Amino acid sequence: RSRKESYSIYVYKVLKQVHPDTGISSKAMGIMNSFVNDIFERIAGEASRLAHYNKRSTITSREIQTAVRLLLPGELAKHAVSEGTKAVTKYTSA
Template sequence: MAPKAEKKPAEEKKTNVADKAPAEKKPKAGKKLPKEGGAAGDKKKKKAKKSVETYKIYIFKVLKQVHPDIGISSKAMGIMNSFINDIFEKLAQEASRLARYNKKPTITSREIQTAVRLVLPGELAKHAVSEGTKAVTKFTSS
């Protein structure tokens, strides 16, 4: 109720101001602002759609390679995506730490490989290193 009470005196003031100044200027400005705001709002809505980078597509592709007949729920997909982001962050931090220890400005495949050996346990690290080496070889050869 209070905002309505405030609006009524404001409208009365506008009529008083309209008597003193040309009435056409104020309503035109009032009409233009919402239209421009609406147009800007449409543009903002288009720009507001941020593309969120996820691993969901890749998780699904790997799942279909390993188990073609099994699906995955959206909750499970979200958990897998969080897991991959977490592992990526841990590897990046460890690789960064290794580069700093060695006073190198660049993180190379060697730092990544060492970070994988430090972060991942035993057999999993060996498989990850071999797959990573294979991927780097394939990338450099093509």
């Protein structure tokens, strides 16, 4: 059997800290897996066209920020930007 790797053991870790007493069935784990694989291929595709309109070779954090701000609508983007800036600040510190 092949490797067949996915996001099923990370979506569950997020679930066990947004609702500590709630499991999730198998098909509703496959749906969250497909959702993550879709939002990934959406944000990375928009960042790849942003890096290619401006003659860059590098997808830094700035293209991911200006791709989140184009894809995600409304207050969801303004929360996601501050969720990511905190994490890259904590990364560059440590």
